[PDB]
């Protein structure tokens, strides 16, 4: 009833050979969002020249839970133990419980604000498990459940994309412009069946997860260098004299390999001080039936070549498609393109404060690739491949991740996709755990004039979330001891600890990395 | 439901030959602690020169129940009956019930403060039975449940130790300094599974207890003096004349004994008027890889001898390790080193007001030990042993305890420990009754700015706690009547009684002892 | 393989007073005052040792 | 071991070594141990037990 | 040698040098045979075709 | 250890040899990989704790 | 017992009372035919080893 709890606090991590189970409970707060209504959100009005986008979408009264991050499921201790004791792991399933719900009215009496509970108020809880709504979740959003278990979790508001103002507009006849505008979808969560719960009710959800592995081990040997120098190779290198070729054997310590360095792009980005085109890769969209108005009413394109339309810089900035990290097996951009978790004062350099995946010592990831030719006049020349695509006989490893990395990303729903090897370290999965949407019930109050007037309320409760992790211990024949995740290298010995104000101390002087793939060697 | 009670008031003591059962119920109050957050507590900031410590630790939002004291479980009447009718007793188990919970919001309306109950509010109750959290409980803390059953019990706030500022700091490289700082643990109770309860719920706990006995009997005969004087001993004492030894028999009333006086240290302490080094024994810690900075940034040591580091007085005071009572079988420090339960006005002497265990008449505990030698020139000389350790063939008794003594102490979790014979009278046990932690639920309220803002609430309920005591009655062949615990010797006849203001009258003129081991003789 | 971060003498809660009082010697009499909150006397004696 | 500690703990690791090439072989077949300094791999380095 | 060496602090240089494995075949169980003994081995092979 | 003399002078001295005493608790010192595993207890009538 | 002072002077003193300490092993002294067989252990809460 009203005086019975619908659950209890569940916490702690279980370790075993084949599986690890994490248990977290958070007290959460859900307010009223967006005035209980749906609104269009147009970035052209919200932005300015420093960062401009034509992004259009819908903001909703709903909010959602986000469990996607490792620091959400692992304490620094438990993350250390994962990295030290297991060669790889992946999430098998997620169980979420929402319970001990409280609905309070916010009512002002004089200057005081009084908080009384409405025992008959309800909460809307929607789970979209088949992903029929947009999936607005960017993996690096700051909306994830809090790291410390005693911190309140404010649920983020849900909003999604509709169209690009430059592409979708009223221009031309039988044009991609109108069709993008006509065909723009609208999603309202009240059109799907969902639960409504009062204080005595609770609910639960389970999600099966299929994905690739997070690999904790590193390759000490470049696959090209794994050979025995004591012996000759039968294979001979060409030597060009005049119009003929003379052959000589490769040296014992240089043996040609069948194995090609993995795909990679070393592009840092423009490095500009604005927010216009910050990513290494930007993309522009021009449907072939698109009509350019020659105004600001549409995107702008000049034809550079026959049947080629080059976007203007404003068009590139406007469509705001930013792609990164794209580096894959190239290691030069690692520090610059993977960075996160930094606030910019500009007063003090955050260069060493920022987190990035730069710390991998793996030997399958390349600085530079050189191709070698000889011209007719006898001049050898070598150039480098800065964008190197998928090619037969490539083998490589993912970059390292840390505890502040998001766990998963959603694979786009499309006909075709290539192998899912992420540069940011997420595990792409076709169906991630379904989003749990939460909304306070809309309690209307009578009004003399016609007006939308409701009762100001909010929801508080406890969310318990649990992931079962499939893991594997390592065996090695290595004689020597290996690197492990440890505090010894920290600049600041007092880290992941509390100060006298209650502040949680993380990475104040420098970013202290607790990365995967630090020490465990696998043989080629 | 909300209108049903989850228990009733349980009280009274049951006496029987082999067991005594005490039953207590208290109404308790649990507030919000520490602003619902964890904070670091550093003694260097809180203290001053009169008492300085480098003690560092964490204060928690949680609070706990403390049952450890006899006056908590025994009325003066029931304590009298234990001391008179039983030769020994020990606690077998503890049962605790928490029920009839009430959660009230504290909300200000104008100048008035209104107390309304939140029927959906919850209480967190954590039991750590395997002692995985620090066990911050000093046995003589004033935090125990109240003696009078109608007094409200305010639960104490929980806080624990992390490190010493002098030892654990950022100094040197690969030094014990950084390692102590790096390796400092942090404990958050929200990382363990625990119950959350609303007003209609209740909970219970049982703890099995294994320990040594509290002994109520005294030895009238020194084990060295138990002999029959009517007969000669065959054993002869040496008499040294020049270079030869002549032998003569021991006198009939002096017969040498095999039995050595028990271990003891007679050290009163410095007796200074400050709080710096008040105990008889102080200890200093210097890990061998410790680096002394020659500043106030670390502890300070001068090398007195080769591979010997003597701490400065400030270092001794700073690490604040105080050990007492250490006296064991030595009786001279008994009064001075066992004292407790005194408030210092300095206006009136509390010398006779203070409680201590000074009242034992037992004959196995020694004033002084003399060792006897003879030099080459024929001069006998005798010196005393002020620190006397464990030695073969020792036998002794514990000192007396009173009703204001704590029942148990926790044995440190360590590889090695010697026999558990306490100078303060507690029963050391490997696992004491697990600590019950209690916390009011954190109910957040929305705030416009980002802020941690909660609803001010508190919990009230009833705690019922029960100990089963294993006891043994005494049989004696003594002809004469024996001393018993009785009021006759009291200076103040009106004691453990109430005055017209409701004050509970205890020991105003003088400390009236109701000690164990007063009268019951055991034969050697 | 494990280490104790806490001296067994220092494991106590400073937030609260100890009932136990330290002696102060003036002339032939003893005055008592409570131990400070951060210094609480312990039952536990340092282990055996010889520094030679 | 099981711990409720929040923070990561010290572990036996090469990071503190003065000589990175240790417990390894040289070109003469010599087994390299502690030439510049004694590199300790001790017990009881990091794992806390509560009192 | 160019990558794995003793240079810098908390650098890939030292870590490659520290983390370099060493393999000794006498740390794995294996057969020892005299003149009258023999041994056999079978290996299943999965692969693509030679066309 | 702490005493006070009759004239009111507190004085403190140190215990350089400290034996087994009631209510002691301590840990062993660390070991390393070059430490011997066992030792033989002498064959005798009496022995104290093996630490 | 053997110490060395700061000025470099080694000095040795003797322990005339030596108590129970970890890792001690010893034997009882001999007896003869005129020795008593038993003694009574005092009736007390605590006693050390009976040697």
Author numbering:
A (entry chain B), B (entry chain A): 44 to 567
C (entry chain I): 259 to 310
D (entry chain I): 517 to 567
E (entry chain J): 208 to 258
F (entry chain I), G (entry chain G): 414 to 464
From the paper:
To expand the structural repertoire of determined capsid structures for the diverse Bocaparvovirus genus, viruses infecting dogs (CnMV), pigs (PBoV1), and rats (RBoV) were selected. The ORFs of these viruses coding for the major capsid protein VP2 were cloned into the pFastBac1 plasmid to enable the production of the virus-like particles (VLPs), using the Bac-to-Bac expression system in insect Sf9 cells. In the icosahedral capsid, the 60 VPs assemble via two-, three-, and fivefold symmetry-related VP interactions, resulting in pores at the fivefold symmetry axes, protrusions surrounding the threefold axes, and depressions at the twofold axes.
